[PDB]
Amino acid sequence: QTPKSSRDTIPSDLSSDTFYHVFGGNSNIFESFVIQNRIMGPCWLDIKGADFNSIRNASHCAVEVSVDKPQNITPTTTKTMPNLRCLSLSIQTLMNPKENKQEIVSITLSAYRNISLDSPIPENIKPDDLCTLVRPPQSTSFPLGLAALAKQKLPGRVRLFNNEKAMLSCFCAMLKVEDPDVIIGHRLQNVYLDVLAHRMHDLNIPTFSSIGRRLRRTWPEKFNMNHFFISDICSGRLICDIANEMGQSLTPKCQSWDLSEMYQVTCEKEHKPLDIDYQNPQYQNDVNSMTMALQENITNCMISAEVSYRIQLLTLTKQLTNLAGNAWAQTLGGTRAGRNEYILLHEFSRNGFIVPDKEPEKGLHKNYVLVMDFNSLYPSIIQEFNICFTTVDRNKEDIDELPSVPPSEVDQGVLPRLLANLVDRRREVKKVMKTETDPHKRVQCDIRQQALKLTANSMYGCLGYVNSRFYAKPLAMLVTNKGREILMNTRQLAESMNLLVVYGDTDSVMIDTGCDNYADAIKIGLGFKRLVNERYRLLEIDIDNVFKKLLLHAKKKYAALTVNEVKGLDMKRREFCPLSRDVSIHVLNTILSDKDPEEALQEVYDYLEDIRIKVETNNIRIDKYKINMKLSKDPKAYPGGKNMPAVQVALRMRKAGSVITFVITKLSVAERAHALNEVMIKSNNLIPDPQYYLEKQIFAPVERLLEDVERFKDTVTLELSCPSCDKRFPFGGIVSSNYYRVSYNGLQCKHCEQLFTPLQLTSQIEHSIRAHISLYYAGWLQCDDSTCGIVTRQVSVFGKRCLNDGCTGVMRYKYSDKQLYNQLLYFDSLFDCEKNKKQELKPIYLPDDLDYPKEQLTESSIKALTEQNRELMETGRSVVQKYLND
Amino acid sequence: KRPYHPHLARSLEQLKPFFVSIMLEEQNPWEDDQHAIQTLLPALYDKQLIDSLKKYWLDNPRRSSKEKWNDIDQIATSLFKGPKQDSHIIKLRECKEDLVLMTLYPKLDVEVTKQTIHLLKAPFCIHPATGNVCVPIDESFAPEKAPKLIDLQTEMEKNNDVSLTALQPFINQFQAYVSSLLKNEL
Amino acid sequence: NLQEASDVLDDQIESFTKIIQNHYKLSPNDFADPTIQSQSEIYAVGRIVPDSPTYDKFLNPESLSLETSRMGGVGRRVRLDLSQVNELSFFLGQIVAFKGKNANGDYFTVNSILPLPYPNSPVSTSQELQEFQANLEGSSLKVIVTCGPYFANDNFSLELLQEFIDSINNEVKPHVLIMFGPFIDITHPLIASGKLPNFPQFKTQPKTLDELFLKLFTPILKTISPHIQTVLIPSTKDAISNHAAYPQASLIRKALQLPKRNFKCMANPSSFQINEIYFGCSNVDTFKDLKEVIKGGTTSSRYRLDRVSEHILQQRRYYPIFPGSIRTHISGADLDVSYLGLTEFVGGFSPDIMIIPSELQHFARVVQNVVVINPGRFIRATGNRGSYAQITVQCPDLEDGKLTLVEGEEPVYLHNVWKRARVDLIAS
Amino acid sequence: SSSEEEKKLYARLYESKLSFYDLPPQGEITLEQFEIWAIDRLKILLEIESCLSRNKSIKEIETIIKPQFQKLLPFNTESLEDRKKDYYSHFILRLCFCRSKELREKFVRAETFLFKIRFNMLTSTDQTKFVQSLQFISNEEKAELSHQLYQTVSASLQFQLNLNEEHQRKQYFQQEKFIKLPFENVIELVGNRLVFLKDGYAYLQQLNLLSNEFASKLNQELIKTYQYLPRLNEDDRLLPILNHLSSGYTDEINAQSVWSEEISSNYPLCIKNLMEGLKKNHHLRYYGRQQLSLFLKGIGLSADEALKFWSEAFTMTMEKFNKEYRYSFRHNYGLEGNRINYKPWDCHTILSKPRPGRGDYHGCPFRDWSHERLSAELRSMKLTQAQIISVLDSCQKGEYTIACTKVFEMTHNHIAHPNLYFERSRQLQKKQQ
Ligand code: SF4
């Protein structure tokens, strides 16, 4: 606070004749407040000289005080903290096609006013209050009988409003009244807070600041700055988002981190989402659909709050913050950079230092597979080899120059001291566990140890991140090479005691134990842990996840049976009929059963044979064959409308969003579809099509579930045209044929005996090469995932991502440089004299082909005709080589 | 290690004539039977010859170092017979070479040479226990020829000019050395 | 490659982001991810793609997307909501810019379009223009443009070519003759079906297509008077050429057996100078391939050639259409996207006169003070007279005032060729 | 780069017929050249390693490696394409074998041995001009110091080239050139009395020095490429090839005649296990079926005889078989679907498949079996205890395929494909008959 030029800072490169550099030009006031006062995260503060009368109507808090100097505030040693008022928020939005604006329809407020982190949270806390607001998505009135019927079946309170304005006014008022301390919800930070702040801005509610704790009457004038403005607006109430980067960091098992998937993975309960869309006209007069929607919202709110209690998000972030000393929010809604920044700031500042100015083995694995943690790899290296800014001698002129590790005579630094301090605290916590009897204190020890290990593991983000305050490429390269060496020696140790490295990186490696009993796999994993700790005294890896059966395709695209369920493969249930889902699920159940997998496989096989027979005889209920699909646009404006069946059925009926249920009957695949209720009617004489559902709907999924001569086996043949009589015929070199004959005077068609002069042959060879190259530059791409298999020429900016929404296949240029190059190589071999003489050429015709040659040439005839036709063959070969050499 | 390095063989050839005159006569360390057993017998390669020489010297005590040197060959010839005798003669000659090297080869202080940062006493510095001057060494130098500080003070009491001591020849040798060093530097 | 192709299709978007930010003086904070929900209006640059990976041939303003680069939106494609824009024109492959909002989370509405700025034209100093005045000797500069194919689909007669060469040698007498393929087109019916007959007028018959060109075009191209500079710019359909993907490496003059005295073989595409003129020459039929999407009466009432000439200028690339169109296989545009650097306006200079042969009717136009000439084909398939181009440019004059001075410490002068050049489309 | 600049630059790079691969190759190759050159040199390395593991003499190794030198990677030739092959293939292998320390150690020893052979295979004049590119001594100077040089270098020659005979050592010395240079550059050799010195000059046993400097320089460059590889992972066309060549380091025949001793006596361990399991369980699961079916297809079992063999082995109901297994058993023979004549499985592809559990017999036993069961098998195969210990040694390292070759040769008198095992066995059996 200065009377003049408070907003103008001092550049570091200020011109002066007595000094030449300035530090701290751009310090942050909270940064200096915390560094000077030695604050480390949330702790009890003793504040003296607090002015209880200077502050008038400045916040949403009941208690308002002020201080005149920062030295009045000092930290205490108290380890207990008061109970937190958490509020659970969930939002259902409605996209307005007119302005492309997401609009707010319903709010579900679940509050938990006595959430205490000092004691283990008991599972399934019931909230102290439940609220659910809703405004009409289409009209200004609701369907009749909403209030009483929602009272009848929905839990908590439901509040009905005529419009979104009184909606958000009451929401803000309830937030001010509740005065919660932590806001909990799923994907709040990057989608829901943003949309909520925007729709608030639009409606001009007086009480927008209630979402935070600082009372403001007007918005910022400038309202990427949207994030800074929103985060400042919500200041005071931490945003506890479970799908944010940290919330994802505490659930490595998930793949979508959608609410249902997170709920299943962390709470071992099942929830089937209802795809909601308030654009649908049914939500304006059908009360039951609206109330099912609100129930979905309330269930999402409870699910989110419960999972955030279960993964221990708040406690772990609190302990990570007390460890790195930054703000709690910077831990909750950020990345490792904030914590790795603040702990280094504190560590160097308290020591009189000047800180800078601001591959898989895919398939089905039957043996037990363990997920073993290398999170503490880089901290282990940094501590062991004393790698620090003050120990390693390096060239700062060239940052890529790899430095050598300090000799043991050098003394330890600041950062490895922090790492060793963290390791020691984890070890003392574990020693306390080994004696502790009360489960509450034992789970407290769990949380403290886990936060210590997470900080140690995230320590590498201080220096490995490029834009980081303490970036140091030489040290990063040294630590990284040492970690690569240690990962290798782990692989070698695993081989030396008879395991495989199934998949592995600097974070985590899964190991083939080779045993089929839980105790045996656990013992093998513990033995390997002891082995690695013996070879590396400080590297203490653990077992994180146990896999009895593993269907592996990547680090994060797999199906397996865990030990303490399917993730990543059940999203597409609409396209597949009831029969296909029954088949897939029964196949999985038998395969994953405890039977001998030659009898379980024969049981699958009998099931498949019986289902094939049942479909062919059509003794299966017509209900089991139905396929549902929602219409995004109108059936008359659908591009390629002749290829998806719903357009055919809907136009035969003749809007968008109407659900069409259909059965492929027994002409085009799209055309054969008939109305499901039509196919039930036997007098219509309609039966399902065995071939379609047996190939595309049942064979395709289980195909994924149950997962010189050689070179050219996929190459294509050269089709010539005879100049005179227009007879087209493949060319296979100096070989037998019913269409062409190589005479002593040149290539001769057999239909009209007219010879090919070299021009009429090389022109056509080169026309075929040009056709192939035009095809290869057309750029056809495909999707490797057999259930998507689309054909495309678009290339998304990330080249290898399939464009099917969320589809996990790997796109590849259909006419690869491999197929194309090989095609040109076969084109060459068609004109190689040595190959033609040796009769090594690929065959054009199969023995069942109707044009198989009746007369087979002799070896002597081939050799003589090749020697007589060497010039022709050489010119033909050079025509191709003029592209092969390009 | 065998065969001997050019440098090592040259040092051995330089040292061989002095070996007798110094060790076997002037010092005569092995005339003491216990000293002989402690220093000579270890350096042999064969246990049977070692034990035989031990017994022969215990039977004939206080035989001179030259006498024991000859007895080594006499008893070795007595013991090792047959087509393998030449190997034993070769090994005994190698042992004798190893021993003369052990007894007369330079024994350098390893530490002072290794590093550029080592400190070594400057020339002409006084020795605190003897008072001798650390004077340069010529071919005729001996420990008794090094002047003492009390003697230099006595000489200086008669004539007050440093050029009139026995220290001055050493300073003149130093001056010749520095002149040569300067011209080779140029 | 595909990683390289994705790299280049990212660099298109990012460099055009940089150019837009420099031109409109916007800070990169404005540039943001358009496919992910937001609360405020944001700025965005990306390519045009079908809102499907497999699409129906015909597109409309309700089935478009705006693909995002790697750091703008990590490769995600966003559908287009274009209901609030009444005047627009896009096309597939066109790196564009938007200001809008994606609160719908699924649809990116554009409140306003940023038209890409047209590149700065070439400039030259007084000394160079005076040298060009001395070179021209007062008389004007004369350049003839021809574009193939030069013989009919049913015969091998170049009588029309010999007529044209006698014409340019004896009456027109142009300084530089620039001529384009296809020379021996690979899609020719008689050449694709293998109906190439015995030639009585060649002592020794040809054996390949290269001998066909050497005996059919070299003897007749040698007859051009050495005073006439000739530039060869190939096409992808030249069977004489061994580079079947745009951009196309220059023909080899020695292999064509052409005289060094008056022939220069140049790469496709090519931007070069003749005296003071900046020429843009590229041989892939953009005027035919670029299939726009039109909204608005003002845009639809405008000349299609004017729109596509403006498109070729703004897209700082001679062939801005991606994916490369296909003739269904017989042929196609044949892009090699690993090298889509080379097909950009060399140095960022919008060429004074841009020559793009097209199968369409011969035209020559000035759009955005750039003379774009499209001469048509030398002979129609039937053998009737085709077309070729005549370019006549008044000699530069610093006193006549048609060259406009550019303010600055160093005096340099804009060429005003649209003021100085007359173009005549004379059927050959 | 114009091809003329490339030609001049390579002529400069190849002023000597052998190289230290100092400067990265410049120019363009087409991915077939990449792959074929890489596989050619890789097979030379694997042959060298197989010869070494058998402790054959360097003269024998030279004799064995001359022919596939003339076959895959020719040397002593003036061709520009052969030299392009050598450089580009070695640098591709540096890309391949930079990932792991065990691989880089293998590449370093292999390329070190290959370099030693190459240096011995050049004439003395070319050895001199290579050393120049370090002044070789004159013949008069060599003859003057002949005795001292021989005394210095005899022990090194005996212990490094295994020339136990004095006459062979003298012959080798007579042809061996020497290098005159300061001792200050050869201090490490000086301390061990490996180099003869006169008047401040060191007379280098040179090939060992050049080999060691090449090995150390190569190791440093390997570490450099391993540092820069995460900038190379971005291109799609290279990584699958690099992964494959990196991991690659790891009717008379009828439905009845397969089960006889005359035929199955030739099968390797994987096939023997697979048919043991089939005969005992009357069924093999997916992977076992696929690998054994394709192996039979390789050895010559026609689709009809294979269908009869599979039907008779499944002692279940033909209906079940005909619905479920005939389609697969025909498709593996290339009679269904896309009609791709599926290739028989090689040890790399077999080992890339997941490990066998309870009831699975697929994969390679040398990796899947505990050492006691292998010991019992090999004791049944009349292998002596030293032979079994050597097999278990090769198996312990992760060299399963080498141990397969060992059991083959030991039971008959580098195989990484079961059909190759069977066919070499058949070629020996017919020869014996
Ligand atoms: S090494 Fe190969 S052929 Fe031999 S048993 Fe193993 S998998 Fe079979």
mmCIF file of N, CA and C in Angstrom, chain D residues 215-258:
data_model
loop_
_atom_site.group_PDB
_atom_site.id
_atom_site.type_symbol
_atom_site.label_atom_id
_atom_site.label_comp_id
_atom_site.label_asym_id
_atom_site.label_seq_id
_atom_site.Cartn_x
_atom_site.Cartn_y
_atom_site.Cartn_z
ATOM 1 N N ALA D 215 34.995 -49.151 -28.696
ATOM 2 C CA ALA D 215 33.958 -49.578 -27.769
ATOM 3 C C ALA D 215 33.526 -48.431 -26.866
ATOM 4 N N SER D 216 34.487 -47.703 -26.298
ATOM 5 C CA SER D 216 34.139 -46.615 -25.389
ATOM 6 C C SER D 216 33.412 -45.495 -26.123
ATOM 7 N N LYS D 217 33.923 -45.104 -27.291
ATOM 8 C CA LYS D 217 33.257 -44.068 -28.068
ATOM 9 C C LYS D 217 31.853 -44.508 -28.443
ATOM 10 N N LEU D 218 31.707 -45.764 -28.863
ATOM 11 C CA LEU D 218 30.405 -46.282 -29.240
ATOM 12 C C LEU D 218 29.453 -46.234 -28.061
ATOM 13 N N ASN D 219 29.941 -46.585 -26.873
ATOM 14 C CA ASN D 219 29.074 -46.579 -25.703
ATOM 15 C C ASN D 219 28.606 -45.168 -25.381
ATOM 16 N N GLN D 220 29.511 -44.195 -25.490
ATOM 17 C CA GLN D 220 29.113 -42.810 -25.269
ATOM 18 C C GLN D 220 28.055 -42.373 -26.276
ATOM 19 N N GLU D 221 28.254 -42.709 -27.552
ATOM 20 C CA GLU D 221 27.262 -42.334 -28.554
ATOM 21 C C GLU D 221 25.944 -43.055 -28.319
ATOM 22 N N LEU D 222 26.002 -44.296 -27.841
ATOM 23 C CA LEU D 222 24.780 -45.021 -27.525
ATOM 24 C C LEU D 222 23.989 -44.295 -26.452
ATOM 25 N N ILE D 223 24.681 -43.809 -25.422
ATOM 26 C CA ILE D 223 23.992 -43.075 -24.365
ATOM 27 C C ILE D 223 23.407 -41.778 -24.916
ATOM 28 N N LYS D 224 24.134 -41.119 -25.820
ATOM 29 C CA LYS D 224 23.606 -39.898 -26.433
ATOM 30 C C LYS D 224 22.314 -40.174 -27.202
ATOM 31 N N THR D 225 22.306 -41.235 -28.011
ATOM 32 C CA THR D 225 21.102 -41.558 -28.769
ATOM 33 C C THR D 225 19.965 -41.976 -27.847
ATOM 34 N N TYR D 226 20.285 -42.625 -26.727
ATOM 35 C CA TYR D 226 19.224 -42.968 -25.786
ATOM 36 C C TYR D 226 18.645 -41.712 -25.151
ATOM 37 N N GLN D 227 19.474 -40.685 -24.974
ATOM 38 C CA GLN D 227 18.947 -39.416 -24.493
ATOM 39 C C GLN D 227 18.022 -38.772 -25.517
ATOM 40 N N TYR D 228 18.383 -38.828 -26.799
ATOM 41 C CA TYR D 228 17.606 -38.122 -27.818
ATOM 42 C C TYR D 228 16.455 -38.936 -28.405
ATOM 43 N N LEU D 229 16.314 -40.199 -28.014
ATOM 44 C CA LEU D 229 15.255 -41.054 -28.554
ATOM 45 C C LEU D 229 13.827 -40.566 -28.291
ATOM 46 N N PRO D 230 13.470 -40.057 -27.101
ATOM 47 C CA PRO D 230 12.119 -39.495 -26.927
ATOM 48 C C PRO D 230 11.798 -38.337 -27.860
ATOM 49 N N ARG D 231 12.771 -37.846 -28.631
ATOM 50 C CA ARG D 231 12.435 -36.963 -29.742
ATOM 51 C C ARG D 231 12.241 -37.752 -31.031
ATOM 52 N N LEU D 232 12.640 -39.024 -31.044
ATOM 53 C CA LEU D 232 12.462 -39.858 -32.225
ATOM 54 C C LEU D 232 11.180 -40.678 -32.169
ATOM 55 N N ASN D 233 10.563 -40.810 -30.993
ATOM 56 C CA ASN D 233 9.363 -41.643 -30.921
ATOM 57 C C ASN D 233 8.172 -41.044 -31.661
ATOM 58 N N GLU D 234 8.281 -39.825 -32.186
ATOM 59 C CA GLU D 234 7.110 -39.186 -32.773
ATOM 60 C C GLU D 234 6.728 -39.753 -34.137
ATOM 61 N N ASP D 235 7.681 -40.287 -34.904
ATOM 62 C CA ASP D 235 7.399 -40.838 -36.233
ATOM 63 C C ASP D 235 6.866 -42.260 -36.094
ATOM 64 N N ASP D 236 5.788 -42.545 -36.827
ATOM 65 C CA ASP D 236 5.097 -43.824 -36.709
ATOM 66 C C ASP D 236 5.778 -44.959 -37.465
ATOM 67 N N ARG D 237 6.492 -44.664 -38.551
ATOM 68 C CA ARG D 237 6.977 -45.729 -39.422
ATOM 69 C C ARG D 237 8.187 -46.453 -38.848
ATOM 70 N N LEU D 238 8.863 -45.851 -37.878
ATOM 71 C CA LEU D 238 10.135 -46.357 -37.384
ATOM 72 C C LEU D 238 9.982 -47.243 -36.161
ATOM 73 N N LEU D 239 9.166 -46.810 -35.203
ATOM 74 C CA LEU D 239 9.067 -47.485 -33.913
ATOM 75 C C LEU D 239 8.677 -48.953 -33.995
ATOM 76 N N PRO D 240 7.695 -49.377 -34.801
ATOM 77 C CA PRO D 240 7.446 -50.825 -34.899
ATOM 78 C C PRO D 240 8.654 -51.597 -35.377
ATOM 79 N N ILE D 241 9.394 -51.056 -36.341
ATOM 80 C CA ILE D 241 10.582 -51.753 -36.818
ATOM 81 C C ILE D 241 11.606 -51.854 -35.698
ATOM 82 N N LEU D 242 11.839 -50.739 -34.995
ATOM 83 C CA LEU D 242 12.826 -50.744 -33.923
ATOM 84 C C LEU D 242 12.424 -51.706 -32.817
ATOM 85 N N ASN D 243 11.142 -51.734 -32.464
ATOM 86 C CA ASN D 243 10.687 -52.678 -31.451
ATOM 87 C C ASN D 243 10.927 -54.113 -31.901
ATOM 88 N N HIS D 244 10.636 -54.415 -33.167
ATOM 89 C CA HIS D 244 10.785 -55.786 -33.646
ATOM 90 C C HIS D 244 12.245 -56.228 -33.646
ATOM 91 N N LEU D 245 13.161 -55.360 -34.092
ATOM 92 C CA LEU D 245 14.569 -55.762 -34.104
ATOM 93 C C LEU D 245 15.207 -55.642 -32.723
ATOM 94 N N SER D 246 14.597 -54.882 -31.813
ATOM 95 C CA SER D 246 15.084 -54.876 -30.439
ATOM 96 C C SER D 246 14.694 -56.152 -29.713
ATOM 97 N N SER D 247 13.415 -56.521 -29.768
ATOM 98 C CA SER D 247 12.940 -57.723 -29.099
ATOM 99 C C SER D 247 13.326 -59.002 -29.827
ATOM 100 N N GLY D 248 13.670 -58.924 -31.115
ATOM 101 C CA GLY D 248 14.065 -60.123 -31.831
ATOM 102 C C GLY D 248 15.276 -60.787 -31.216
ATOM 103 N N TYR D 249 16.016 -60.048 -30.388
ATOM 104 C CA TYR D 249 17.149 -60.616 -29.674
ATOM 105 C C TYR D 249 16.720 -61.715 -28.710
ATOM 106 N N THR D 250 15.432 -61.792 -28.376
ATOM 107 C CA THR D 250 14.912 -62.856 -27.518
ATOM 108 C C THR D 250 14.504 -64.067 -28.347
ATOM 109 N N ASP D 251 0.839 -88.439 -48.929
ATOM 110 C CA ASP D 251 1.668 -87.515 -48.167
ATOM 111 C C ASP D 251 2.360 -88.222 -47.010
ATOM 112 N N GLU D 252 3.672 -88.010 -46.891
ATOM 113 C CA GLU D 252 4.415 -88.598 -45.781
ATOM 114 C C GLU D 252 3.913 -88.073 -44.443
ATOM 115 N N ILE D 253 3.643 -86.776 -44.358
ATOM 116 C CA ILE D 253 3.074 -86.174 -43.159
ATOM 117 C C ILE D 253 1.559 -86.213 -43.304
ATOM 118 N N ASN D 254 0.897 -86.915 -42.391
ATOM 119 C CA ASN D 254 -0.541 -87.112 -42.464
ATOM 120 C C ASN D 254 -1.111 -87.055 -41.054
ATOM 121 N N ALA D 255 -2.412 -87.337 -40.941
ATOM 122 C CA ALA D 255 -3.077 -87.248 -39.644
ATOM 123 C C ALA D 255 -2.497 -88.237 -38.645
ATOM 124 N N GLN D 256 -1.870 -89.305 -39.135
ATOM 125 C CA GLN D 256 -1.343 -90.370 -38.293
ATOM 126 C C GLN D 256 0.162 -90.251 -38.100
ATOM 127 N N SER D 257 0.891 -89.981 -39.184
ATOM 128 C CA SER D 257 2.345 -90.047 -39.140
ATOM 129 C C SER D 257 2.953 -88.982 -38.239
ATOM 130 N N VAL D 258 2.203 -87.934 -37.890
ATOM 131 C CA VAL D 258 2.729 -86.934 -36.971
ATOM 132 C C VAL D 258 2.994 -87.518 -35.590
#
